[PDB]
Amino acid sequence: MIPHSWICEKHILWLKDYKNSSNWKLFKECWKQGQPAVVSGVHKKMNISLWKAESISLDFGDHQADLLNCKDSIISNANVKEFWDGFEEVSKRQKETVVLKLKDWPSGEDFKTMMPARYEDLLKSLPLPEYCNPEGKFNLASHLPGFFVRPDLGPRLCSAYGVVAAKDHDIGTTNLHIEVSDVVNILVYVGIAKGNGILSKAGILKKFEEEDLDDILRKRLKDSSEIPGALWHIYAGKDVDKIREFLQKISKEQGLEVLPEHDPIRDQSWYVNKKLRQRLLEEYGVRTCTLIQFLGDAIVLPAGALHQVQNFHSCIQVTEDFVSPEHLVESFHLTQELR
Ligand SMILES: [Cl-]
Ligand SMILES: [Mn+2]
Numbered sequence: 001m002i003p004h005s006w007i008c009e010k011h012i013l014w015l016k017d018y019k020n021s022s023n024w025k026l027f028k029e030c031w032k033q034g035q036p037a038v039v040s041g042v043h044k045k046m047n048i049s050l051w052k053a054e055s056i057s058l059d060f061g062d063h064q065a066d067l068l069n070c071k072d073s074i075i076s077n078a079n080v081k082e083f084w085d086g087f088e089e090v091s092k093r094q095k096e097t098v099v100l101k102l103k104d105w106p107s108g109e110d111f112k113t114m115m116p117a118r119y120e121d122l123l124k125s126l127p128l129p130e131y132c133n134p135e136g137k138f139n140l141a142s143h144l145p146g147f148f149v150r151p152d153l154g155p156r157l158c159s160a161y162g163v164v165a166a167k168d169h170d171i172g173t174t175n176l177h178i179e180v181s182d183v184v185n186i187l188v189y190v191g192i193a194k195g196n197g198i199l200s201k202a203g204i205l206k207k208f209e210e211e212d213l214d215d216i217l218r219k220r221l222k223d224s225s226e227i228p229g230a231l232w233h234i235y236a237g238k239d240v241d242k243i244r245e246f247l248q249k250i251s252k253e254q255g256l257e258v259l260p261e262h263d264p265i266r267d268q269s270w271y272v273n274k275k276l277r278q279r280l281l282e283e284y285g286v287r288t289c290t291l292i293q294f295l296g297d298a299i300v301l302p303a304g305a306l307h308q309v310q311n312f313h314s315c316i317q318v319t320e321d322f323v324s325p326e327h328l329v330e331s332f333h334l335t336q337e338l339r
Contacts, residue, residue, distance in 0.1 A: 002026045006291035008043065008221050013037040013126070014216070018045055018296075024130040024138075027300075030036075032130075036236060038303050039127035043296030046125045050118050051188035051316060056159070057084040060106070060114070070160065070173050073269070083159075087314050090165050090195035097196065101160035101170050106332065108154030112173040112215075115157075122155060122186075122318060127298045132184050132322050135205055143325040149323065150180055150335050151292045153298050156169075162230075162311040165198045172271030173230070174309035176247075178240060182322045185299040190229040192316030194214045203314050208292055217292055229315045233277065233290040237304030237330070240265065242284040250276065271308055303331035 002023060003016040013030040015023045018041040028152060049055060060080075067076040067083050077087075077096065083100055086093035086145050093100070112119045124134040133160060134142050141153060160173040177267035192201050199207065208221060208228050220226055235243060251255075264270050272280065277288045293309075303309065304327060 004260050005216050006336065007038070007216055007291065008234075009287070011035055011289045012234070012291065015039045018042050018127055024128050027128055027131070028138075031302065031324065032225045034304070034327070035298065036234060036305060037128070038291065038293075038300065040129055041296050041316060042159065042298045044186060045186065046296075047121045048188070050121055053084065053087050053159070053189055053314070053316060053320070054248060056157075056189075063105075065102060065105045068101045068103055070101050070163070070307065071166070071171050072125075073175075076100055080154070081332075084334070085160070087161065088191045088193050090193050090198050093161070093165070094147050096167075097165050099161050099163050099166050099173065101158070101173055101270065103158055103160075105159075107156040108152055111155045113155060114230045117279060118318075119155060122214050124183065126320060128300065129310075131182075131324050134228055134318060134322075139322050140328065141321065144323060145255050148328075148332055148335070149185055150321070150338065153181065153321045153323075155198075155321075156318045158319065160311050160315060162193065162204075162313045162315070164204055165196065166197065169310065170271060170273045172289070173179070173311040173315075174307070175268045176233075176243075176270045177268040178237075178265055178271055178334065179301050179303055179305050179307070181303050181331045182327055183301050184322065185293075185298050185301070185317055185319045186314060187229050187293045187295055188318050189316040190227045190295045193314055207312060212290060213292070214290070220294065221292065224227040226325045227295040227313075228268055228292045229311065229313050230317075231310040231312060232233065232293055232299065233308050234291060234301070235286065235306040237302065237306065239284075239286045240304070240306060242286050243280065243306065246263055246280050246284050246286070247272075251281075256258040265295040265306070271310070279312060280336075303334060305326040
């Protein structure tokens with residue numbers, strides 16, 4: 001047997017054993033319906049020390065990059081060194097402190113070449129390797145001619161503060177967006193921030209518990225060996241048009257001026273907060289799947305799926321693109337629309 005459960009009223013397959021070599025056989029049956037999957041325990045496969053903030057900060061801290069304020073998506077005056085200093089030290093953050101993100105750094109070929117050991121560890125550790133590994137039999141990514149695949153097909157590193165210190169749970173560390181290709185998202189480090197009156201690890205666990213959760217998720221949360229990092233909301237790709245209309249309607253309501261051809265999904269300008277998700281369900285019938293991503297959880301999303309993320313703790317995520325047959329058509333079309 002293949003240990004598994006379902007989360008979110010059958011939308012998401014939870015594969016419970018990263019070591020089970022037949023995971024793909026069950027995944028295949030759920031993927032073909034456009035269901036996401038999450039594989040827990042991948043950090044146990046990884047060289048987890050390579051992915052700690054202290055290690056990534058030391059190895060790559062001298063390179064300059066833009067830091068984003070997640071509240072308004074305005075590039076910050078902070079440098080990479082100031083970003084990493086504030087990763088777990090709230091007092092070293094600039095002011096109410098800001099939620100910073102170091103996005104896609106490094107990414108694509110630079111990831112493979114500048115972090116070769118981490119890239120090697122990633123390849124070794126990718127779950128569902130039949131799909132997710134470049135040499136997997138169902139992965140078309142390295143076989144397709146160039147124009148079928150996005151130009152930025154690569155691994156990505158994403159590091160960001162949690163929103164808890166700012167006490168602003170209207171902030172997304174990743175705004176609502178659509179996935180142009182199949183993708184696996186792995187939480188490889190969770191950092192507990194300290195200072196300036198921030199909620200503690202335990203106060204933050206209670207914050208997670210106050211969310212509307214599936215019973216299966218509440219159980220994981222009681223488990224002291226699991227470290228919850230980030231709150232995810234995931235939407236079925238079939239709901240993309242309704243969500244876009246909902247956001248355009250909210251935009252008009254708040255008097256938020258827009259261009260005529262205004263596409264809030266493409267803009268990636270929204271974090272759909274609790275009150276808004278409730279209105280989205282009531283007014284358009286669109287259901288939210290809620291996931292808490294724990295350290296070592298790999299979330300696997302098909303092309304066309306939408307999601308947003310809200311780090312509670314400081315988090316480092318590594319994502320990897322792949323191209324399954326199942327969603328190639330959708331992926332190609334979304335890829336072309338990206339022009
Ligand atoms: Cl490396
Ligand atoms: Mn994404």
